[PDB]
């Protein structure tokens, strides 16, 4: 009558997943390599299991939320034949080939596998603000959607077990590159007498322009249409040099902007200085 | 009564500025090094002037919107004494020390100077979605704010003529780094059979999580508070390796992520793997600790 779910991995995100499943009223079994991280959840109604095999054998569905697929696959090695007749969902960020290999590891012991990628922070889990992408057999996603729906908005992205991970590689590239730019910006600003609290209203303004700019860049890349520029490659080839000089003056490394400059300069050298900045990423090939 | 404004520089942003000032009912004079670029604005009601001196002498306020301060200073040199008794606003992105240099060039010929930085794209200009930062004498900003308010939301950031540029250097760093990430992401997604149109709903979701994350990282940096992590440095140290491997496999250079990894790895090596990702940027220093 009541669905069973196991969560293996009780770092910040695995705690968040466990609390959401417990609030939904599922029977939740938890396991972590560092055992005592389960204690806060046992106080909230979770059941612990002492080993990965015992944890997976307790439920129809096991979610594995750990640092990477070396950790996932180590947990599956320890679990042995426990996945047989059960479903494993990988929720551990790694490459598409690791998601496919882990699918194979689970199938070769008689389990079924979905791969997922959580694209939102812990505060969002258990709300309509969370976004989780899934890949693998459509029917298996449909079979477990009822339990998984309490976690957030789910999107199935394809049959290929690696496809959620492929989205994750692209989306986390955008995310972490932006985070690197933000932390750099705060360092250089602070060296110029602008504390983070004073910058932040304006930094929110920059975040506010990204969606419409990205929409246009994506459309231009699909159209292969880089003409009629509103902001040219030659203009940013001038600007990025200023930004690097400012970094240098402040004693802050400029490696992200230096990499960017290399692409911009290669676009100018290729004869596309007059084109929209949608052209620059072409020069990232090699 | 009717305000007089000159725009010097008719690239895409100078055209946008000029259209917004004309749409507001101002008396707009325009000048560009390449004179043919003035025709569409003359049809909208702009006056054109043949030289920078004649352009600046036509108006109480001159906006200079060109690629950099080497171009600004070449235009103001050509204008000679035309700025005397008038106000020049630089709207051309460059360093704080170039903004201060240009301020002194204007003051040398008896003009007044504000430096400004436009922080939004051409479509926003003339709307409440635009943002322009200004630096220089507060009273001079106040004198011209009624004309300038037709371009967008305005922020005066202080009396030092370099200070709008200092914000610009920080904010464009964030912006272009993010654009570099985005263009890279599209190329790696395409190699993996995900076209830009299929990625974009999800990319908008990532943009949607940045502001609260940035607000937290800024508070932690101010507080020097990197503990009780919800996303640890050790975790991103693993993640960024995956990202770089995926770039390699797609035939795409991973320079930006490689640079980030070096900071992440240095933070782990400093014994801060369990800390929040707010700690990473410390390792960007090139100063002796
Ligand atoms: N935190 C977040 O906001 C988000 C996280 N994610 C993803 O969720 C996953 C988990 O993230 P998060 O909770 O932050 O934690 P981490 O990525 O820091 O992973 C820590 C967890 O992995 C376990 N682990 C590490 N190595 C091994 C191993 N060899 N064997 C067994 N378990 C191991 C840890 O066990 P122990 O406690 O014993 O050290 C702990 O449970 C990651 O893949 C991350 O990318 C996705 C979106 C957001
Ligand atoms: N486009 C945008 O969305 C935004 C632009 N900005 C800033 O606004 C400024 C203008 O941007 P944008 O319109 O895109 O154009 P560009 O940065 O490409 O600059 C082009 C303008 O500069 C002029 N110019 C270049 N070199 C010289 C020179 N030596 N002497 C005289 N004029 C010269 C060009 O003249 P000519 O026509 O004869 O070549 C043209 O008018 C830049 O500093 C930019 O960073 C700010 C926010 C957004
Ligand atoms: C600092 C929070 C990071 C969450 C992010 C979600 C895409 C990466 O794991
Ligand atoms: C691609 C449009 C670029 C606008 C940007 C505004 C901060 C930089 O000039």
Numbering used by the authors:
A (entry chain A): 3 to 288
B (entry chain B): 3 to 291
Q: Can you list sentences taken from the study reporting this PDB entry?
A:
In the early 2010s, Mitsukura et al. discovered, purified and characterized NADPH-dependent imine reductases (IREDs) from Streptomyces strains, a new enzyme class capable of the conversion of heterocyclic prochiral imines to chiral amines with high enantioselectivity. Crystallographic studies so far indicate a close similarity in the overall structure of these enzymes. They consist of an N-terminal Rossmann-fold and a C-terminal helical domain, connected by a long interdomain helix, and constitute a catalytically active dimer by reciprocal domain sharing. Out of all the IREDs we tested, the S-enantioselective IRED from Mycobacterium smegmatis (S-IRED-Ms), a member of the IRED superfamily 3 (SFam3) first characterized by Wetzl et al. in 2015, proved to be the only one capable of reducing both 3-thiazolines and 2H-1,4-benzothiazines with promising activity and excellent enantioselectivity. In order to further elucidate this, we present a high-resolution crystal structure of S-IRED-Ms together with its cofactor NADPH, the first published structure of an SFam3 IRED.
